[PDB]
Design a protein around this motif. Structure first.
Motif, PDB file in Angstrom:
ATOM      1  N   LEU E 191       8.794  10.892 -21.956  1.00 56.59           N
ATOM      2  CA  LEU E 191       7.449  11.432 -22.149  1.00 56.59           C
ATOM      3  C   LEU E 191       7.430  12.694 -23.000  1.00 56.59           C
ATOM      4  O   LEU E 191       6.438  13.426 -22.998  1.00 56.59           O
ATOM      5  CB  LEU E 191       6.757  11.692 -20.808  1.00 56.59           C
ATOM      6  CG  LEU E 191       6.701  10.498 -19.858  1.00 56.59           C
ATOM      7  CD1 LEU E 191       6.204  10.928 -18.495  1.00 56.59           C
ATOM      8  CD2 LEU E 191       5.824   9.406 -20.431  1.00 56.59           C
ATOM      9  N   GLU E 192       8.509  12.985 -23.716  1.00 53.47           N
ATOM     10  CA  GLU E 192       8.623  14.238 -24.453  1.00 53.47           C
ATOM     11  C   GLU E 192       7.863  14.128 -25.770  1.00 53.47           C
ATOM     12  O   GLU E 192       8.248  13.356 -26.652  1.00 53.47           O
ATOM     13  CB  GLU E 192      10.091  14.573 -24.692  1.00 53.47           C
ATOM     14  CG  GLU E 192      10.357  16.023 -25.043  1.00 53.47           C
ATOM     15  CD  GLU E 192      10.108  16.339 -26.497  1.00 53.47           C
ATOM     16  OE1 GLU E 192      10.989  16.047 -27.326  1.00 53.47           O
ATOM     17  OE2 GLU E 192       9.042  16.900 -26.812  1.00 53.47           O
ATOM     18  N   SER E 193       6.785  14.904 -25.904  1.00 53.27           N
ATOM     19  CA  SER E 193       5.921  14.891 -27.091  1.00 53.27           C
ATOM     20  C   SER E 193       5.454  13.488 -27.465  1.00 53.27           C
ATOM     21  O   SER E 193       5.167  13.213 -28.630  1.00 53.27           O
ATOM     22  CB  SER E 193       6.612  15.551 -28.283  1.00 53.27           C
ATOM     23  OG  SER E 193       6.904  16.909 -28.012  1.00 53.27           O
ATOM     24  N   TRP E 194       5.390  12.584 -26.487  1.00 52.13           N
ATOM     25  CA  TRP E 194       5.186  11.174 -26.799  1.00 52.13           C
ATOM     26  C   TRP E 194       3.852  10.928 -27.495  1.00 52.13           C
ATOM     27  O   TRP E 194       3.773  10.108 -28.414  1.00 52.13           O
ATOM     28  CB  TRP E 194       5.312  10.333 -25.524  1.00 52.13           C
ATOM     29  CG  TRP E 194       4.097  10.318 -24.635  1.00 52.13           C
ATOM     30  CD1 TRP E 194       3.908  11.064 -23.513  1.00 52.13           C
ATOM     31  CD2 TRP E 194       2.923   9.509 -24.778  1.00 52.13           C
ATOM     32  NE1 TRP E 194       2.689  10.786 -22.957  1.00 52.13           N
ATOM     33  CE2 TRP E 194       2.063   9.832 -23.713  1.00 52.13           C
ATOM     34  CE3 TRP E 194       2.512   8.548 -25.705  1.00 52.13           C
ATOM     35  CZ2 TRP E 194       0.821   9.232 -23.550  1.00 52.13           C
ATOM     36  CZ3 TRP E 194       1.280   7.955 -25.541  1.00 52.13           C
ATOM     37  CH2 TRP E 194       0.449   8.299 -24.473  1.00 52.13           C
ATOM     38  N   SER E 195       2.797  11.636 -27.093  1.00 55.19           N
ATOM     39  CA  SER E 195       1.482  11.416 -27.690  1.00 55.19           C
ATOM     40  C   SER E 195       1.216  12.322 -28.888  1.00 55.19           C
ATOM     41  O   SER E 195       0.931  11.839 -29.987  1.00 55.19           O
ATOM     42  CB  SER E 195       0.390  11.603 -26.634  1.00 55.19           C
ATOM     43  OG  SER E 195      -0.889  11.388 -27.194  1.00 55.19           O
ATOM     44  N   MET E 196       1.302  13.636 -28.691  1.00 49.89           N
ATOM     45  CA  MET E 196       0.986  14.562 -29.772  1.00 49.89           C
ATOM     46  C   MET E 196       1.999  14.477 -30.902  1.00 49.89           C
ATOM     47  O   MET E 196       1.651  14.717 -32.063  1.00 49.89           O
ATOM     48  CB  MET E 196       0.904  15.990 -29.239  1.00 49.89           C
ATOM     49  CG  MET E 196      -0.134  16.191 -28.152  1.00 49.89           C
ATOM     50  SD  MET E 196      -1.818  15.817 -28.664  1.00 49.89           S
ATOM     51  CE  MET E 196      -2.251  17.316 -29.529  1.00 49.89           C
ATOM     52  N   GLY E 197       3.247  14.154 -30.587  1.00 56.03           N
ATOM     53  CA  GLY E 197       4.302  14.163 -31.575  1.00 56.03           C
ATOM     54  C   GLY E 197       4.560  12.830 -32.241  1.00 56.03           C
ATOM     55  O   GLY E 197       4.970  12.792 -33.403  1.00 56.03           O
ATOM     56  N   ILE E 198       4.330  11.728 -31.528  1.00 55.94           N
ATOM     57  CA  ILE E 198       4.623  10.407 -32.073  1.00 55.94           C
ATOM     58  C   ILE E 198       3.371   9.556 -32.242  1.00 55.94           C
ATOM     59  O   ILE E 198       3.043   9.139 -33.356  1.00 55.94           O
ATOM     60  CB  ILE E 198       5.643   9.667 -31.188  1.00 55.94           C
ATOM     61  CG1 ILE E 198       6.875  10.533 -30.931  1.00 55.94           C
ATOM     62  CG2 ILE E 198       6.044   8.353 -31.828  1.00 55.94           C
ATOM     63  CD1 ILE E 198       7.673  10.844 -32.163  1.00 55.94           C
ATOM     64  N   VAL E 199       2.668   9.282 -31.143  1.00 57.35           N
ATOM     65  CA  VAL E 199       1.701   8.187 -31.147  1.00 57.35           C
ATOM     66  C   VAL E 199       0.390   8.579 -31.821  1.00 57.35           C
ATOM     67  O   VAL E 199      -0.216   7.765 -32.525  1.00 57.35           O
ATOM     68  CB  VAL E 199       1.475   7.680 -29.714  1.00 57.35           C
ATOM     69  CG1 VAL E 199       0.466   6.552 -29.704  1.00 57.35           C
ATOM     70  CG2 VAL E 199       2.780   7.201 -29.125  1.00 57.35           C
ATOM     71  N   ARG E 200      -0.081   9.809 -31.632  1.00 52.96           N
ATOM     72  CA  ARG E 200      -1.251  10.248 -32.394  1.00 52.96           C
ATOM     73  C   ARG E 200      -1.022  10.246 -33.898  1.00 52.96           C
ATOM     74  O   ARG E 200      -1.911   9.781 -34.631  1.00 52.96           O
ATOM     75  CB  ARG E 200      -1.733  11.614 -31.899  1.00 52.96           C
ATOM     76  CG  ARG E 200      -2.393  11.581 -30.540  1.00 52.96           C
ATOM     77  CD  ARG E 200      -3.081  12.895 -30.247  1.00 52.96           C
ATOM     78  NE  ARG E 200      -3.485  13.006 -28.853  1.00 52.96           N
ATOM     79  CZ  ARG E 200      -4.671  12.643 -28.387  1.00 52.96           C
ATOM     80  NH1 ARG E 200      -5.579  12.082 -29.168  1.00 52.96           N
ATOM     81  NH2 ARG E 200      -4.947  12.829 -27.101  1.00 52.96           N
TER      82      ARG E 200
ATOM     83  N   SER F 193       1.997  17.766 -23.369  1.00 51.76           N
ATOM     84  CA  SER F 193       1.231  18.768 -24.118  1.00 51.76           C
ATOM     85  C   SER F 193      -0.141  19.037 -23.509  1.00 51.76           C
ATOM     86  O   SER F 193      -1.076  19.420 -24.210  1.00 51.76           O
ATOM     87  CB  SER F 193       1.084  18.367 -25.586  1.00 51.76           C
ATOM     88  OG  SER F 193       2.347  18.276 -26.217  1.00 51.76           O
ATOM     89  N   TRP F 194      -0.279  18.813 -22.201  1.00 50.83           N
ATOM     90  CA  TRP F 194      -1.602  18.818 -21.587  1.00 50.83           C
ATOM     91  C   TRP F 194      -2.287  20.174 -21.720  1.00 50.83           C
ATOM     92  O   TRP F 194      -3.499  20.239 -21.951  1.00 50.83           O
ATOM     93  CB  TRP F 194      -1.498  18.382 -20.122  1.00 50.83           C
ATOM     94  CG  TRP F 194      -1.040  19.444 -19.161  1.00 50.83           C
ATOM     95  CD1 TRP F 194       0.220  19.602 -18.672  1.00 50.83           C
ATOM     96  CD2 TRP F 194      -1.834  20.473 -18.558  1.00 50.83           C
ATOM     97  NE1 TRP F 194       0.267  20.671 -17.817  1.00 50.83           N
ATOM     98  CE2 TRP F 194      -0.982  21.223 -17.727  1.00 50.83           C
ATOM     99  CE3 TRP F 194      -3.180  20.838 -18.643  1.00 50.83           C
ATOM    100  CZ2 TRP F 194      -1.428  22.312 -16.990  1.00 50.83           C
ATOM    101  CZ3 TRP F 194      -3.620  21.919 -17.912  1.00 50.83           C
ATOM    102  CH2 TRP F 194      -2.747  22.645 -17.096  1.00 50.83           C
ATOM    103  N   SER F 195      -1.536  21.268 -21.598  1.00 43.28           N
ATOM    104  CA  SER F 195      -2.135  22.599 -21.675  1.00 43.28           C
ATOM    105  C   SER F 195      -2.147  23.158 -23.094  1.00 43.28           C
ATOM    106  O   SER F 195      -3.208  23.495 -23.624  1.00 43.28           O
ATOM    107  CB  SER F 195      -1.399  23.557 -20.735  1.00 43.28           C
ATOM    108  OG  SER F 195      -1.970  24.849 -20.792  1.00 43.28           O
ATOM    109  N   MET F 196      -0.975  23.259 -23.722  1.00 42.97           N
ATOM    110  CA  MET F 196      -0.904  23.857 -25.050  1.00 42.97           C
ATOM    111  C   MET F 196      -1.602  22.998 -26.093  1.00 42.97           C
ATOM    112  O   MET F 196      -2.128  23.528 -27.078  1.00 42.97           O
ATOM    113  CB  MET F 196       0.552  24.090 -25.448  1.00 42.97           C
ATOM    114  CG  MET F 196       1.319  24.993 -24.501  1.00 42.97           C
ATOM    115  SD  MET F 196       0.634  26.651 -24.346  1.00 42.97           S
ATOM    116  CE  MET F 196       1.286  27.430 -25.815  1.00 42.97           C
TER     117      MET F 196
END
Lengths: 224, 215, 271, 271, 271, 271, 224, 215
Positions: E191-200, F193-196
């Motif tokens: 789950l490390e940066s999974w959305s903001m870093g990869i999937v978005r 990244s829920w907060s930042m």
């Protein structure tokens, strides 16, 4: 490069109001707290405002509490200082400065802008009379000759600028600090050049005084 | 809230001298919280030492800083002309930055004789109703100099005006301008003009001069 | 008729049919609340108005029926009590919200009166027996957590005081007030950007900041572990208590089977 | 009078009333420690001074009462011992901290003397019986973890040596010393920015850096899992041991019920 | 003398004293491996050389003693086998590493010969009985995981094939090869940066990329949950099997106590 | 011959040899599917074509054999049914995909026909008995989760409605539609990244946004905890149910052993 | 602002080698893939290289495979194109361009630099002969007068620049595309001005040809 | 790998006309993968439409794009002089960008007569051994123009050279220069010079001319 450029400034009346603006480049502006620092004419430095990196906290000395208001726009990458009830005390160069550490609202100021002058004075803003200093008809030895520009009768110290041949003469130049006569400043500058560029209009004294919206490009014509 | 005092206010150091300037703090502070800035002539200050002793990026390793508690210092092991500047200590506490008064380093360069030049007004100022005779004194050293204005024999110091550059940081000579402002006629009914510039290199003044019948 | 009609109507309202029927009505009403869209025909809006009016009257007779059967007990089951509140709110949200907003005009009500929608979604819990079961199971776990939740809250308060005093002077956006510090410590407890986003910037200024936050992480992680372990062993205790007694009951069955014969085995000697 | 007054005073100090009364005093003192604010009236500060003086004398007589009943045992219960220390510190923190700071002046004491506040928060654990219970339960888990915590610490030390030697030459902010490496490996264990923040930048320079950190993640995750499983099965062992004995006790009850009759069933033959 | 000296020496090597003595020697040697520092005196280096020579000969006689007692069994206990290897490596790392590096010169050996240090740290597991216990417990869990680890590995391979084909054409730094995709899917599993870093960023280009990664997260999370649950219920099965038999044993004790008397109760009728 | 050949062929197809043999064929085919690479020799491609043709006919006779033994039951075991589908797809994927793509040309099929590869990977689950066991165990957990998964989905829907209405006006990339909000709330549930990344930017504009997301985190974390606890205690219930009955069976054995003698102990009095 | 500035370029011989450089500003350079795009003299656009955001993947058409090599330094925020075995085919304006999406090595090119010219030619690099076009003695009506600058005999199309009065004449200017004579380019420019600035040396034709290291500032003196 | 063809190569649209230009693709592509750029005269291309139809930031909403599969188009609902530019379609697939040939929009402005100017060489070119008489034709429209060089009566077209600006995007007039290059003596032994600029506005040529005895 990390760069800061301040804007606004110039003359105001006492009790007047003015807004300084600082534009940030080359770094994540929203990661850093920002400060404004005065330098008064006796060159004493004085910090006047700090704002946190999100803008939610602001700090001032009691010299300027309630008179000044620091603000920022993290999208425009811009920093502002609103000033009000301005006093002759507030005559200074104002520097925009970035903090050394991210989010830290203290510590040190690692990058400083060029500054903008503020001149809180009653006296009437006036334009510079710019006179050529054509050299004496005499030894004039041509191997070198001293040439001069006289910038006289203006008011407020700065923003002001003088330049020789659009800056191609970035050498041999000595620009003298402005000094008062009767309530009015006199500035002058010297350039010494080989006759390989003089006599000609190539020796232009490029001078500007935005505080009176004034610019001229007078020529040091050959004397006769 | 915390005052910083710097000693001396001015220092005149030879090239190659070890230099030390002191910042004294009205209260004990952390050495991590004392900073030094260098300001060159009419440029913004630049950070110079971070904490008491960590040099800023690009500061010559001839600079060092040391101190703790209420007393701090900046040292140059061997001064160079590029070191001629004002140095400010700074602290932060509570939520305020405070600065020291600054210490201006003069570098006592070897002498140079002033290259003296002189200028009658251009007729644009005469048509402006007045005159200003100007004298230039470029690349002299030391700063200490007498400029001296005679106008058909008599001195007329009543309108003398003087401005110095700083040490130029190119070779740390001084440059100066001198001006005598005069009325329309106090120019047009007088012929011979001189700035009798006498200097530490030149006990014989340079007496750079012109006559006003020709141009 | 009379109590015989009540006997008839009870056998309807408590029927598996009526339970299922209302579930499908909720699903259909929930679907209609998905097809609405600001950008729609006026006649579509009119049709959806009539359809939503049909739903609100149809659930209204359901509430009246359930009140008529359960009576004094209806207003004591929390599930029936919730369904009643939702019907009342949904009447207000369609025949008085205009009369409210036309006088107590506020840009909050355009956002608050959404509650009439949200409440009708939650009826999909209240009507479905399997959903009431899981929700009551989840709620029943909460009382056992209160002492460890109170402990965690007190630890958070202690650390929030210290973090405000230690770091809030220079990092006010993170620790400058007790409420800043509570929020930032909660982020750190979730491990979200805890090092790269908070503590590494802090250690630019406060080198030993690691001595605060790493012990903090250990404490809150350890309390979270024991909170979860408590829920596991509580649920297991509810199980093992049954296995235990069932073995005892069969031991006491065996006690009965044998000792009632050891009685006979002496009177059988009287012959 | 005398031992009869001691018998009277014991029946007060050990009462449920006195236990509850002191809890409310702690809650009220904790609330008063929230209303204080540097920006407040001088007369509000004076009033809060008198109120806090009332609390400190009131908790002082509580400590003296508890000492008077429990005596030699008071200084052996860790809970009573903690409450005593907090009262002593809170006397120092209000009538000698000035006399300390006026001579041993240090900017740490303005931050260290906060401990008198923090200690009085912790009394809300010590006074509440449910909180003593949960805290002693949590503490009792710690001895069982020590061997697996020691193992994890040794693995961390081994990887910190290697990570400093492998990557610290070029990424000194992350691995340049053993303490940097310990901190960065702890960040990686929490999975916080482990790939985007650490290992992907490392693989810009050290393409096989994934061969270090991904096996590290597996090891520390596996040890963390088994640490938590150990706590679960320990707590379950504490349960099952009771279920077991209760069944044996009833088996031995059944042993008694039958065999005391198998005795009779032979003397009943003597007739 | 002879076998009587062997009987004497066994009673030393297997003593609790000798076990503890070697543990402290390891701790002292581990401490000496902390005081070393490239920036140190030449005479400090000489002194540390002699001290480290004393340790290596002192552990050498320990190995020889243990071999002399345990003999054919020494080279079969994996713990003793590890300690032997570490002593051999530590001899090489101090009396032949120069003779190696002076001919097979390579900048890897300045990093590989660190292994002689790391091995002597690991002896702190092998010597301490509590650490051997926890490590063998952890290792014994691994065989039960192999089928679910194999399943997770096969799922990862399937998703890595698909993610390379779907996204690797345009995001090669994340999916451009099977090895890129394996690494990025492992990051997503953590789950490390999974959305903001990869999937978005992916959904800027591949709007339905959420249809890949969110089901992926569910699958790997569900398998991880069941992996942990399996370890819990395996350890509980080892417990419950004992509780079960202990109850049966007491039931069979009760069987003995009673039926051996029901035998007598008929021969007691012969009189 | 006839049913005797069927009796012969059954003893082959159900043999441990045939089970293992097919596993190795799958492993070898999976390996051959790794050596393929667009950048390869034409003659290597031809050889790999023949090899893959050998595999597809060899798995085809395996399917026919399994159908010939299991017949009507083959098309009812889901495992055999999956293997049949994969063989059919793998015939299509090598002798008709060209005939498909040459007419129904679509850039999806160059990505969809990958399914013939992925399906042949999944046979490594279906063939290995230990993998069928673990997968059926994992699948059997899913029905017990459905009520709590439905609850979580309904909570997500409620919060997605609210988050779209509250924040979607100004943060449309995160909340501007119900599907944006569902995705962002899932990110928040994973704490990624829920907060930042989300809530601190939101609180630049909506200071009380923490009052939305922090209660959301508590709810979804609590439901996730109870979901996992349910799986634990379900698996434990499956164990304890066996321990329970085995004790009862031995109690009923002891019932038999004793009461069949308490019968005799009265007819033994007739003498 | 997001900004890209290309550098290098100018004349080379066939078979020669040259390295272009692009400096990035105003965005996180390491988040974006970058491309080089040719524009050939018939204005056909042709993409010539792409590099991934970490630099680990690079892509080329077969027109330039093995001849060109794209590279980047994410710390210097700079992009490079090494070119080798250069051919007359490679005569083009080369643009540095950022990709529309982060990490995406495809899609679209949302920001383009100003470009640098490359002129793969055998012909001898030569300096511009710069001639004033003093206006005819005639109607010369002073209310306006056309003035001209002639920039003749140079080779390679660009880098070249012409400017009037250091850019203060940012109006009334019409600069004509360079066109060949016998193997040599001729360029010219027109400015039309009121006599309020002419006759004077204020009408300077500022012209530069860095491909021959050449700069001059010729004056359109009054004709007589 | 995939070729993009654009039609027409040039288009001449009135102000206020609806304009449509077509991009045709040799294979079916996703509409998400087709892009449009606008290049003004001697500036870099700028993105104009993202995918088939999403306008780039700052593109006037009079622009639109539509298409799918193998055929795409860009439309202007009402052309303005600032729209006069070359428009390139672009696609991406495999790992290659490919571009269309471009479509140049001419805007058929109303006419303007050429302001015609003429220049004899400065003596600097004479001392360079030659001459170049120059003629300027500023702010005319249309582009189509004849320039015509006579030198003491006879035409001498042998050295005529012509260069046009583009439509200036200020008002979309054209500007032109014309030059006749001559030897040293082909100037110095001839007196009268003319560029007989005749234009669509001016069937009478402007015949701007000079004599060479005076200057």
């Amino acid at each position: 490069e990390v760069q800061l450029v301040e804007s606004g400034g110039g003359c105001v009346k006492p009790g007047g109001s003015l807004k300084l603006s600082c534009a940030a480049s080359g770094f994540t502006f929203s990661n850093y707290a920002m400060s404004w620092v005065r330098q008064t004419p006796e060159k004493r430095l004085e910090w006047v405002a700090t704002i946190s990196n999100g803008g939610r906290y602001t700090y001032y000395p009691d010299s300027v509490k309630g008179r000044f208001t620091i603000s920022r726009d993290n999208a425009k990458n811009s920093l502002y200082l609103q000033m009000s009830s301005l006093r002759s005390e507030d005559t200074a160069m104002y520097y925009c400065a970035r903090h050394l550490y991210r989010y830290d609202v203290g510590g040190a100021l690692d990058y400083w802008g060029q500054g903008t002058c503020v001149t809180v004075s009653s006296a009437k803003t006036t334009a510079p009379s710019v006179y050529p200093l054509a050299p004496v008809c005499g030894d004039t030895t041509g191997s070198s000759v001293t040439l001069g520009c006289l910038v006289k009768g203006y008011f407020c110290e700065c923003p002001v600028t003088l330049t020789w041949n659009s800056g191609s003469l970035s050498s041999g130049v000595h620009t003298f600090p402005a000094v008062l006569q009767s309530d009015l400043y006199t500035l002058s500058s010297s350039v010494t050049v080989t006759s390989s560029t003089w006599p000609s209009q190539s020796i232009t004294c490029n001078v500007a005084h935005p505080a009176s919206s004034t610019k001229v490009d007078k020529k040091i014509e050959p004397r006769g | 809230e915390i005052v910083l005092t710097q000693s001396p206010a001015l220092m005149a150091a030879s090239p190659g001298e070890k230099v030390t300037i002191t910042c004294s703090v009205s209260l004990s502070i952390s050495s991590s919280n004392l900073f030094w800035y260098q300001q060159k002539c009419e440029t913004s200050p630049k950070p110079w030492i971070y904490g008491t002793s960590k040099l800023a990026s690009g500061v010559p390793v001839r600079f060092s800083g040391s101190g703790s508690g209420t007393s701090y210092s900046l040292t140059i092991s061997s001064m160079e002309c590029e070191d001629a500047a004002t140095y400010y200590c700074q602290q932060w506490s509570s939520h305020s930055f405070t600065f020291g008064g600054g210490t201006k380093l003069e570098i006592k360069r070897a002498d140079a004789a002033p290259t003296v030049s002189i200028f009658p007004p251009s007729s644009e100022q005469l048509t402006s109703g007045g005159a200003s005779v100007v004298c230039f004194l470029n690349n002299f050293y030391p700063k200490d100099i007498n400029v001296k204005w005679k106008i058909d024999g008599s001195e007329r110091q009543n309108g003398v005006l003087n401005s110095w550059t700083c040490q130029d940081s190119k070779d740390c000579t001084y440059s100066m301008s001198s001006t005598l402002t005069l009325t329309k006629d106090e120019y047009e009914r007088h012929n011979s003009y001189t700035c009798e510039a006498t200097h530490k290199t030149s006990t014989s003044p340079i007496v750079k001069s012109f006559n006003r019948n020709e141009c | 008729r009379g109590s015989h009609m009540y006997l008839r109507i009870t056998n309807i309202v408590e029927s598996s049919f009526f339970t299922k029927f209302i579930i499908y009505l909720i699903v259909l009403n929930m679907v209609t609340m998905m097809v609405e869209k600001e950008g729609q025909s006026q006649h579509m809006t009119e049709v959806l108005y009539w359809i939503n009016v049909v739903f609100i009257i149809l659930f209204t007779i359901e509430i009246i029926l359930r009140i008529y059967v359960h009576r004094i007990s209806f207003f004591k089951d929390p599930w029936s009590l919730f369904d009643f509140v939702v019907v009342i709110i949904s009447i207000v949200g369609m025949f008085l919200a205009d009369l409210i907003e036309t006088y107590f005009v506020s840009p909050t009500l355009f956002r608050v009166i959404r509650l009439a929608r949200i409440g009708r979604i939650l009826r999909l819990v209240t009507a479905v027996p399997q959903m009431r079961k899981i929700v009551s199971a989840l709620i029943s776990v909460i009382p056992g957590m209160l002492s460890v939740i109170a402990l965690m809250t007190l630890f958070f308060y202690i650390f929030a005081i210290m973090a405000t005093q230690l770091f809030g002077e220079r990092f006010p956006e993170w620790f400058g007030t007790l409420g800043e510090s509570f929020y930032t410590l909660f982020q750190v407890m979730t491990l979200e950007s805890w090092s790269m986003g908070i503590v590494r910037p802090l250690m630019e200024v406060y080198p030993y900041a690691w001595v605060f936050f790493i012990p903090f992480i250990f404490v809150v992680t350890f309390v979270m572990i024991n909170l979860v372990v408590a829920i596991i062993v509580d649920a297991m205790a509810i199980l093992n208590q049954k296995e235990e007694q069932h073995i005892i009951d069969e031991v006491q069955s065996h006690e009965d089977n044998i000792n009632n014969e050891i009685i006979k085995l002496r009177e059988e000697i009287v012959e």
